[PDB]
Amino acid sequence: SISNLSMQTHAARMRTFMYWPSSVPVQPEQLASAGFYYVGRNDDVKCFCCDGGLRCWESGDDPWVEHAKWFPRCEFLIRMKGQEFVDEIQGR
Amino acid sequence: AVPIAQ
Ligand SMILES: [Zn+2]
């Protein structure tokens, strides 16, 4: 099951980052590739697959790492990064 | 980052 099918494609996710705040220390490409799209306020994003949302990004944050840290069971996460990556993150 | 509370 996919929470948000209109956001399945990387291209559609990138579009939502049109008004991504430049003050935020994480680039839209990286968020889009990790399955996130912009909800439209501040720095809130959601995964099109698991629907997990993240906010308050900090300098050095890695979208895939945070994805695996907070939502280790996302099917998109597992499909893109592999179970070993997830387990490895969880093991920190 | 942190989860958006639901
Ligand atoms: Zn996800």
Side-chain angles (χ1 to χ4, degrees):
Chain A
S1 71
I2 288 177
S3 305
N4 185 344
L5 296 159
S6 64
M7 293 296 113
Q8 299 185 43
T9 65
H10 190 275
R13 298 196 290 275
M14 275 307 296
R15 241 174 277 125
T16 75
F17 285 102
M18 200 58 44
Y19 303 120
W20 185 246
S22 56
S23 70
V24 184
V26 179
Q27 298 307 287
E29 285 84 356
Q30 303 247 41
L31 285 154
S33 291
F36 296 113
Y37 58 99
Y38 182 34
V39 310
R41 287 282 147 77
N42 299 287
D43 69 351
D44 297 15
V45 306
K46 294 193 142 95
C47 181
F48 75 97
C49 184
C50 70
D51 196 48
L54 295 175
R55 48 123 86 183
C56 305
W57 294 86
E58 291 166 322
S59 197
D61 277 356
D62 179 333
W64 273 133
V65 168
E66 298 301 286
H67 205 144
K69 180 182 186 291
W70 299 102
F71 317 115
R73 296 178 323 276
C74 176
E75 294 175 350
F76 181 76
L77 159 67
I78 296 173
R79 215 175 80 232
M80 298 293 122
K81 309 288 299 189
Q83 184 69 52
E84 180 172 299
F85 169 85
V86 181
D87 293 350
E88 196 273 296
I89 295 308
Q90 288 299 304
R92 303 171 176 189
Chain B
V2 307
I4 296 171
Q6 299 299 302

